[PDB]
Amino acid sequence: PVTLEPVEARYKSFSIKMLKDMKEGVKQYGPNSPYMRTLLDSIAHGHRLIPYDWEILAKSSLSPSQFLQFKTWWIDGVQEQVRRNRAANPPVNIDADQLLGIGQNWSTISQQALMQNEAIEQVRAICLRAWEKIQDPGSACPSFNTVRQGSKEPYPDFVARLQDVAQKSIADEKARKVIVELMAYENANPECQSAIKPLKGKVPAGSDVISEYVKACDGIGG
Amino acid sequence: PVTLEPVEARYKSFSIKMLKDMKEGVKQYGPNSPYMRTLLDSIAHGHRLIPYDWEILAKSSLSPSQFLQFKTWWIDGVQEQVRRNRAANPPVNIDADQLLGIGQNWSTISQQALMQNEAIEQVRAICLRAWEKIQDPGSACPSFNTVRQGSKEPYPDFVARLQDVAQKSIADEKARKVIVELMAYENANPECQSAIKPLKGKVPAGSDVISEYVKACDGIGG
Amino acid sequence: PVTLEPVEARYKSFSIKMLKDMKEGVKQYGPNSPYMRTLLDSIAHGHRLIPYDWEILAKSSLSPSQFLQFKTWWIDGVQEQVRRNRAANPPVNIDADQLLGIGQNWSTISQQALMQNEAIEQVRAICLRAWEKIQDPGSACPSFNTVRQGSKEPYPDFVARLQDVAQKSIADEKARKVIVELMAYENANPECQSAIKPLKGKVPAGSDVISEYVKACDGIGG
Amino acid sequence: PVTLEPVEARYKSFSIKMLKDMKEGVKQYGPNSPYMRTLLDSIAHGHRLIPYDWEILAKSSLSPSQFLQFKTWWIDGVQEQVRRNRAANPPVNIDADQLLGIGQNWSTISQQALMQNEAIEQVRAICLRAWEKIQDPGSACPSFNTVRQGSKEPYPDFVARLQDVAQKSIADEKARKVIVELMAYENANPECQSAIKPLKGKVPAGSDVISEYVKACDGIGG
C-alpha cells in the first residue's frame, strides 16, 4: 500500500502477520471462498494498492499454478480496458503499461507511487475480477450442461455449484441471474422437479425465486 | 371487427375468404409459423377486435385441442392483468368479465361494441400471447435440458428449436436473449464446440452473437 | 452492531478477529454445535444487531448452500410473525419489510439504526431460530422412523441424534420433550429394550427420564 | 418497395397475395429453385427495395433456420464490400450501417427511403448472393469429393448436383465453369467413363461441353 503525508508518498511492505492470514485462507478455505472475498475487499478498499503490491500479495498467497492464471486474466482484462478508453470521448490517457506496471515509465516503486486515484480504481476492478476466475487446484471450469443434480444429493448444494460456474463464465450480473433460475429447474432431479412446478413463475412477496425452490424440496434427499 | 361511422358501431362477420386463409395456414404451416404471426398481426392491428371476434377466429381456425389451450391461457392471463390494474395508482376499472366477455354486462355484441380503445389494446396483448403458447398437434413443450444438438444435424436447425422453447416458456424478451446464447454453446455437439470457443464473447461489429456461431460451423454436418 | 451515545447511533463493522472465530467454528464444529450456540448467543444478547448485520455475519461464516437455507427460513418466519402481529389487540405496526430490511424505508444503515428495541428483540428470535434449522453440509433432515439404534452402537449417541431431529422439526419445546422419551424406548435395540423396561415410568427423585435410561445400558455396546 | 412522385418517397407494404406466393414457393420448390430465382429477380429489378424490405420478405418467406443463414451472409458480404469501397480511388462513402440498416442514421423507414440509387444496387447484389447460399432444410453443403455418380443413377441428375455445389462454394462464374467440366468425367461411373472418353476436349460447333456428355450416356442407367 501507499501511505501519504500532510504531499509525499511512502511505500511500506505488508505485515508478516497479514501475509500469514492470506496464506492460511487460500490454502484451507479457497481463494474464492466468501471469507476471502470479504478479507481481500477489506484490504483493497481500505488501502491504496499499486500494481507492484498486487504481485507481492498474490505470489505469496497463491500456488504457482494459480499465479499463472491470475497474471493471465490481468493481462486479458487490460486489453479490453484500453479498447474502452480510446473509444471514449474525451479519450483517457491510460495505456497498457501503466495498468500492468511494466516498461521503464512505470516499473519502479517511486514511479508507480505518483499514480492518480482514477487509475487506482481502474486496476482494482481488473485485479478483483482476475481473482474471481482462479480455479480450485485440481479443477477445471465445467460447462452448464454437466452441472446436473445427482441422486441422493441435497438441493442447495446443487444450486450453489450453478452460481459458481456462472460467476467465472459470465461477466454481467444481470445476465447471471437469468441463467441460474432456469437451469435450477431443468437440471434438477425428478423428485425436485415434482415439487417446483406448482411454484414456477410465482413468488408471493419480499422473497427471491431461489429461496422458494429450496423450501419446496426441503426434505428430499439421500 | 367493429366498424364505425362519422358515432355508432356496426358489427360485420369475417369474410368467407379470410376465414379460409387462416384455416389453410394453421393446418399446413402451423399456428406459430412466422407466416401466421405476420398474418394474424395484420388483422389485429388493422381492425378492431372485440372478445367475441377472437372466439370466432380461433374456433374456426384451430383444432379442438388447440382451442382448449387458447382459452386456458386467455383465462390465466386475465388473472395477472387485474392484479396489475388494482395495484396501480389510480386504479383502472377494467375487471375480469370485460376482458373475457362473460357475465351479463359484456355478453352480447351490442354490449361489447361500445368498449374503449384502452381495453381493446389490453385484450389484444393477452390473446396474442395466448396464441404464442399453442403447441403443435402431437407435441408437448420440452425442457432446456433435452434440447441437445444430435450427431449429423445442422447447427441452425438446433438453435431454432432453442428459440422456440424460450418463446413459450419465458415471458420476458430480454431474459430470452440471455438463455439462448449460453445454451447454444453448452448443448451443442463436440464438433461445433470445437469451432465456437475461439469466438466466444467476441463479436467484431454490427452483428449478433448468433450469426457468428452459425458462420463458424458452416460445413459441419452429416 | 449499533453503538450509542449519552442519542445518536454509530454503526461500526465487526472485528477482523471476531469474524475469524465464527468461520473457524462453523467450519470445524458445525453451525449448531453447542459451542457455537453459546458463542452466537453471546453476540446477539451482548450487542444490538440490525438486519444488515445478520447478513454480514452469516454470509461470511457460512457456506453458500447454508446461506440459502438461512435466508429461506428468515423469510418463512417473518410471514408467520405478521400473522400474529395483525391478529393482536392492539395491532402492532411491525410489517415485513422492517424485519427483513428491504424496500426503501428500511434498506440503509442510517434507516435501520433508528429501530425500536421491541423490533430488535423480534428479529433476534427469528434469526436465531433460522440458524437452528441449517443442516450439516452433505446432509438432509431425517424422519423419526429412520432414527433407529443400530447394533454395536452406544446408547447416548443414539438419543443425541433424536434430540437433533426434534430440534429442527418441532418448534415447541414442551412437545419436543414428549416425543424423545417415547422414541428412546421404541427405536432402541433389543439389548437396551431388555434393560429399560423395569424402569419405564418410574424416576426416583431429582433426575430426568433420560439419565436413568443411559445408566441402565451403561456397558452394552460393540 | 419505395414508390415515388413527380420528389417525395412513399413506403407501402407488400401485398397479402405477393407474400403468399413467395411462402408457397420456398416451402414447396425450394428457395433456390429456378422458379424462385426468376420470381425473386422479378421483384428486385422491378421495384426499389430498401434494407427494411429485405427483412420483411425474408422473415415471412423463410424458415427460422434459413433466416439465420441469410442474415449471416448478408453481414459477411458487407464486410468485404467496404474493404473494396475504401481501397478505391476516389473513396466511396458507403459504410456498413447504411447497407445493413442499423444505427440511428439508417434505422427507420423515413431515413432509408432517401437512399441513392448507387447504394440500392449495392445491397441488391449482396442480398441476392446471400440467398444463393441458403441450404435445403435438413441439409449441409457437401464437398466436391463426395459428389460421385452412383450406380443405377441417371447422368444429368449427377451433373446437376455438381452445379449446385459449385454455386454455393465458388463465387466466380468463370471459375465455376472450369471445375464442373473436369469433375463431370472424373467423378462419374465407369459406364459413362466408357462413353465420354472418345469425345473429351472436342466439341463440333455451337454447343457446350456438357450437352455432348449427356447425349453420349443417354441410355445408360438402372
Numbering used by the authors:
A (entry chain A), B (entry chain A), C (entry chain A), D (entry chain A): 1 to 6, 21 to 236
The paper states:
CA forms the capsid shell surrounding the viral core that protects and transports the viral genome and also interacts with host cell factors that are necessary for trafficking, nuclear entry and proviral integration. Further, we assemble particles from HML2 CArec in vitro and use single-particle cryogenic electron microscopy (cryo-EM) to determine the high-resolution structures of four different types of Fullerene shell assemblies. Our studies of HML2 CArec show that an ERV retains the ability to form capsid assemblies using the same architecture as exogenous viruses. Analysis of the shell structures reveals the intra- and inter-molecular interactions that drives CA assembly into pentamers and hexamers and their association into shells that encapsidate the retroviral genome.
The majority species comprises 12 HML2 CArec pentamers with all interfaces equivalent, obeying perfect T = 1 icosahedral symmetry. The structure is resolved at the highest resolution (2.7 Å), likely corresponding to the 32S species observed in sedimentation experiments. The NTDs of each pentamer are associated proximal to the five-fold axis and form a layer of structure at a radius of 86.3 Å (NTD centroid distance) from the particle centre. Beneath the NTDs, the CTDs form an “inner cage” layer at a radius of 64.7 Å (CTD centroid distance), and more distal to the five-fold axis. The NTD layer does not contribute to inter-pentamer interactions and so the entire inter-pentamer interface is mediated through inner cage CTD–CTD interactions across icosahedral two-fold axes. In HML2, the vertical displacement between the NTD and CTD, as judged by the centre of mass (CoM) of the two layers, is 21.6 Å. In the pentamer, residue R143 located at the C terminus of α6 in the NTD makes a hydrogen bond to the main-chain carbonyl of K182, located at the C terminus of α7 in the CTD. This configuration facilitates formation of a specific hydrogen bonding arrangement between CTD residues D171 on α7 and K229 on α10 with S79′ and D90′ on α4 of the neighbouring monomer NTD (′ denoting a neighbouring monomer) and defines the pentamer conformation. By comparison, at the unique type of CTD–CTD interface in the T = 1 particle the α8 centroid displacement is maintained at 12 Å, but the crossing angle is significantly enlarged to 65°. This has the effect of twisting the interface relative to the solution state to meet the constraint imposed by icosahedral particle geometry, although remarkably, the hydrophobic interactions of A189, V192 and I193 are preserved, and although much of the polar network is lost, a new compensatory S157–E200–N159 interaction contact is present.
